[PDB]
Design a protein around this ligand. Sequence first.
Ligand SMILES: CCCCCCCCCCC(CCCCCCCCCC)(CO[C@H]1O[C@@H](CO)[C@H](O[C@@H]2O[C@@H](CO)[C@H](O)[C@@H](O)[C@@H]2O)[C@@H](O)[C@@H]1O)CO[C@H]1O[C@@H](CO)[C@H](O[C@@H]2O[C@@H](CO)[C@H](O)[C@@H](O)[C@@H]2O)[C@@H](O)[C@H]1O
Ligand SMILES: CCCCCCCCCCCC(=O)OC[C@H](COP(=O)(O)OCC[N+](C)(C)C)OC(=O)CCCCCCCCCCC
Lengths: 448, 416, 351, 66, 217
Amino acid sequence: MLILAIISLITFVSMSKLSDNRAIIRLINIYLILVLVLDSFLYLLFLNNQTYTVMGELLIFNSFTFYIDMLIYFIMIVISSLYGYNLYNNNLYKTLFEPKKELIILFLINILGALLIVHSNDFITLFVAIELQSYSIYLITAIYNSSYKASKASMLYFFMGGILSILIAYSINTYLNLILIALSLGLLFKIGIAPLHKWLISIYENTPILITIYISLIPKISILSYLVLSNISINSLVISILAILTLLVGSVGGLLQIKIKRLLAFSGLTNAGYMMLLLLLNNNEFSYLYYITQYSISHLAIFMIIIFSIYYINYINNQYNPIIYVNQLKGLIHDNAYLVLSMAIVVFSFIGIPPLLGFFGKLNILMSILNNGYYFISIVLIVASLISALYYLYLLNVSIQDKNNILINSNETVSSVLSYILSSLIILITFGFIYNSLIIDIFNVYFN
Amino acid sequence: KDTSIFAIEMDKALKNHDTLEALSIFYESFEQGAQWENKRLHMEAMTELLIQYAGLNDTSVADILQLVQRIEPICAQGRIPYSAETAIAQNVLQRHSDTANFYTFMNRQYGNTADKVTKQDPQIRPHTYQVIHDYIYSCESERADLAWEMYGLLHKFYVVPFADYYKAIKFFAQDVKRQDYALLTFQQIRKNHDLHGQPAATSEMVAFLFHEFAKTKYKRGIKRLHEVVALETSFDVNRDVLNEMMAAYVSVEDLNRVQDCWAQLQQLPPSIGANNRSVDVLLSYFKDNIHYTERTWQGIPEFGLLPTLENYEQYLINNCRTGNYRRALEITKNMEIDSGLKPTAKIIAAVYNYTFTEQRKLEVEQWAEKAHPEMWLELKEGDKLKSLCLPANSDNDNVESLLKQASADMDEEMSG
Amino acid sequence: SFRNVSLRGSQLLGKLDSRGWGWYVAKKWNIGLVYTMCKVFLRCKKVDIKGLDNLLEAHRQARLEGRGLLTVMNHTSVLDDPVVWGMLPNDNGWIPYLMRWATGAKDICYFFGAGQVLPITRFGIGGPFQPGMDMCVRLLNPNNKIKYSAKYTPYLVHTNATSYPFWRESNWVHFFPEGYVHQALEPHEGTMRYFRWGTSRAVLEPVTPPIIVPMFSHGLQKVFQEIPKGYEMEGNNTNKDRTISIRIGEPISETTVAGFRNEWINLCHKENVGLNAETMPDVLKNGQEAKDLRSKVAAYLREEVEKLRLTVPNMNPELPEFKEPEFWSDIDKVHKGVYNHRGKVRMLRNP
Amino acid sequence: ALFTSLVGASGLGFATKFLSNKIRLKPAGYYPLGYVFSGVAWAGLGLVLHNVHQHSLEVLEKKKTA
Amino acid sequence: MSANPAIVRPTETTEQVLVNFTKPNSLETVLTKCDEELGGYSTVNLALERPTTGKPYGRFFGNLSLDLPKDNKMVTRSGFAMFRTLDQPTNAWNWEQYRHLELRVRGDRRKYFVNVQSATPLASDLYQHRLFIQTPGEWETVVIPIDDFILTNKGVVQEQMAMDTANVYTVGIGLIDRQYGPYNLDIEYIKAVAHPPLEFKPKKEYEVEKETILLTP
Ligand SMILES: CCCCCCCCCCC(CCCCCCCCCC)(CO[C@H]1O[C@@H](CO)[C@H](O[C@@H]2O[C@@H](CO)[C@H](O)[C@@H](O)[C@@H]2O)[C@@H](O)[C@@H]1O)CO[C@H]1O[C@@H](CO)[C@H](O[C@@H]2O[C@@H](CO)[C@H](O)[C@@H](O)[C@@H]2O)[C@@H](O)[C@H]1O
Ligand SMILES: CCCCCCCCCCCC(=O)OC[C@H](COP(=O)(O)OCC[N+](C)(C)C)OC(=O)CCCCCCCCCCC
């Protein structure tokens, strides 16, 4: 699978000695595409509908893990494309994000940790993988630090999370439902949920946007994919309260944001609250896979849209986060009308307007929670969707205003690869529903 | 035979340009047990001996070092007379390239950097200082590094005048293309002003350095110089420094800093505010932006200024490179009437080259032939008129993107 | 210019334009489809274009400087209005504010709303001062902030320093100064009538002189004939090369426009009204001097278009009487056929 | 069954190329060979999906028959 | 429309007046510091001047001496004089939506500095940018980009880290001229402003005389 690919890539980069830090990224991208093709062929030829255990009894490989691996393939190919190919061949976008060999090594380590989280069958492998991912996130954030308080807060958050994980490991080693519940909240706290999210939204706000596009997506996918695959907290009141509170905070608290990346972090919190409701349910593989795939596509699409929008502003706050406030996108329809159309498609998918993928994901979640006797959380989900739609429509309203300003550097060659990838994501969001019956049948036969 | 007789004979042989005979006499006097000591004749004797030995092309450096080592005990404090200090220095520097041996030659006289500096005076012994100066300012870009060392050398044994600072910044920034050495020279000026008692650095130096950094897009130097200027209380920032900072940040394609420099320039009174150099920089910033170029051109009378030939040339380049060929041709035609400036060969060449269309090129050719026949004929004699045009966009590309590429190609071709 | 004219033009513009994202998309796609049909029609036939660059470069200069663009052309076909704009590039085909905003007809003197067509009355009611003319003047006005100048005085630093002069709004007014479709025959084929006073009013009124670009098309009168098979009759046809020739001349000299506007300024100073006055005096509306100046401007525009005419290979010199307003008086509207005005021209008249 | 899947996938590829051109502020039809390449790639993806879905339907019929 | 949520979100402003000497209660906002705390002989005084013509302003004046005090002997460089806004108790300012700093001053030949205290790893770190006086004796607005201040520790340039621009505590003007003699600075206000749009015209006060295309209102 990808585990071998990641370790081979780490070995290659560790002893590469290449002067350019983007040629190695492009080689990594080509390798990832080739390994995706090879692994898909291998799975559909010799690994369909099987659950293998590799090494000892620590790493599991099943259909769920394979599909999460494909999702990581797709996201990682997109992110490597963003890293390798400068969107414009100008100084601004070159200084916007400059990868370094340490950064590639750290990203590969983080991806390996997330994969081990997904493929974990034993609590030892779990412990190791989560600590590896947390250390990778802390180091990646510490590489780019423009403030002292932010660095201290990130360090304290990582230390507290590690201490909590160590305490959970010691408690489970001493030995039952209480231990599993404590582990569940310990894992859930690391992706950002209502009573402890503030630090993660702060870190996302104070991070380079081309780092934020990664660090806001992979941990959620990994943790929620491990949690869903290993059903240990079902019909839990604690998870119910946490999910309801996370939805309420992400929706109502998202209305109070004027910074674009704070708003995106709160949207991610709300979307995690949506998926965290699926932990209360039986037979939640298809719904969770659908929602995580569509959410990953929408997250990548909106982050690419914001990155594209950087070229149409007459000033830059700082080289790492050129756009900070939402009003910097006022009248963006008069600079690139189709970029605003794509952003409208993405936000309407986030709201859950048919026939976009977000609507189908939310409908799957809602049907699952209704057909098993949960009615209050259905109303909670609907109200949260409306309140989130409020600030999504705010972003639209700001971005479709009137702007008469003349822009310096109006023309330059937009990267063909990045624009094509963004268009592909938008078209996926727009017309993936035509493949819904095929997806359902494929999941019924192969993944079950 | 006394040592004085040997010295007289050696001096007489030297006066006949017979260096080998003088060396033979010296070695024979050593073989005969002659005693050499501090006496008036002897210093001149071996000084002329060393001068004439250094005057031989076939003489090796090792033999010179051996002779100097042999002579050193005779001389008091190991200090040969200044005539030898000039002639041997000239031989080592002008005729050969050995900076280490010459460095050790001074170190023999003065082996301590901070101690016993006993700084000399240029008027007393100008020959050695002139020789060192010529050696420093005669090296090319290949020998530039060594020159830098020699520059520091000149500051460790002599008190250079302040004009050498200006002309050394100019030499390192322009001639040998070592702009880092120019920045280090400026930093040395600042260090000597703040630590020692020396005259302060001038805003002219930093303006010149900013100009040279813009000439080669030296981003590191631009950032370091900006940081130095921000906290430097010995000199201020006038319009010239602001103009050159804005040019430097235009060269490195920075939005915020160019806008900051223009904001600083725009708030000064127009007497000491923006000038035609500011207009040049601001027109070169808006190369491919015709709207802000047009707003810049209309603002020249707003600041109490009148366009110059460079202003017109850059304005016409900006007009042609954005597709407005007819507008640029009309401006060129009416330039003499409205402004009183006669279009020159540079202006006509810029209009012709940047007009990437066969029909419009023919039109400008006809205008030039009818109006300035001899100038157009001169432009036909060399290779100033290029024939690059937009290719047929079989890729169905919009004219703006297809035209910016042509403008960049013409910029590269006319750069040199 | 005068305040009342601009106010009435703005009122009629607001009546015929909502400036809303809903109406804008409808107008955009309507104009784009019409332009696409005209473009396909043009490639279906044989057409020779000489000077398209002049119209394209004078439109971008006008929008760049905020002057406004004016176009003068001959009226030989009923459907020559949209068809001729099929030669324009796609940027000027689907962008409605980068497109024409007029139909013409130059007054009487003596899906159209989404097609950017304003109404002009061609009958003997009113005169050269109609709400359509006020609208044309208003669209030729960039702002109400700058003073009236005979020559283009730059103003983009005081207003529109970072803005656009005509932001998402057209400045391209295109008249048909003849007023009616002219379909003369051999030997005086392609000749025009006298240009009317409305185009002169659009030349003089705006506070910023436009960039007038003459045009001439010959051949569309052989397609959209006023009478059926009018040019195919025996003895009425000599050339069988059904070739459409479109010629776009150089923008006219700004010195002549500045001189005409200076005459307008002197006429304004003849009365006590200022350059920017609240209302137009009746003397300037119906007066000998204003009428003479308007006739002179119209004659100059007609002379420019006639000079452009000779570039068409199959043409003959025009009789000196054809340019005189008096020559086309006492014209008949009843024959409905091959008409023989004063035995000098043969026309395909169809009322 | 191949015709509809391939046609829809090719349409999706055409849409992706058109949107890529339009978000770059480039006219439709820019690099027309790109339309062909995008359509062919998406059609191949749709063909793979169709084969896998055919295997899915074949397996489903077996359980329903029994 | 943004509707009601426009009042629920944090308010946004295009400027923030840091120090305003126009009001007659300005001493309570700002505090002065000379070298007498180190034993130096340079004095610092501050006062509000309200002329009949023109807006009221504040006078930051004194006698910047550079004599080593004969009490402790362990001071070496013993000349400086500064004034800064009172210590920040919100616990800090927020400049993240701001780009420039505007100082309306009427300076002299003396050599002034703009000092900013924000969240730094060292409590003695200071962001400094020299106050460039261009027309001494006449009122002028000095605009200093906020990203052009340099980080120093007791006058020594340190490793360059960007200003936090979200935890700014105090701002003020200091005097490290290292020159004897009296000094007097007249200050109207110090504000933090956003990025100004491009202008291609001198300020209205510094306007050249010619015909105006604009119509007189
Ligand atoms: C959701 C879908 C929405 C997509 C909407 C499509 C709307 C595109 C309109 C059709 C379109 C692209 C055809 C591919 C389109 C998609 C292909 C399949 C997808 C089906 C949907 C026809 O393109 C023609 O252009 C030719 C290039 O010369 C090419 O011929 C061959 O190509 C190679 C063969 O391999 C050979 O190497 C090459 O030798 C051949 O020449 C062909 O591309 C084709 O004949 C657009 O082109 C048309 O419009 C413009 C160009 O803006 C053109 O005007 C240009 O610019 C004018 C000033 O602006 C100026 O007058 C002038 O500068 C120029 O005239 C037109 O003249 C016309 O060309
Ligand atoms: C319920 C919705 C049903 C309709 C959906 C499809 C819309 C089709 C639009 C046709 C035009 C087009 O495709 O794009 C063309 C125009 C762009 O304007 P332009 O000046 O012509 O520049 C064209 C680009 N250039 C200059 C490079 C050539 O788009 C628009 O003006 C924006 C979309 C319509 C109005 C949006 C604001 C209000 C609604 C916001 C919804 C998010």
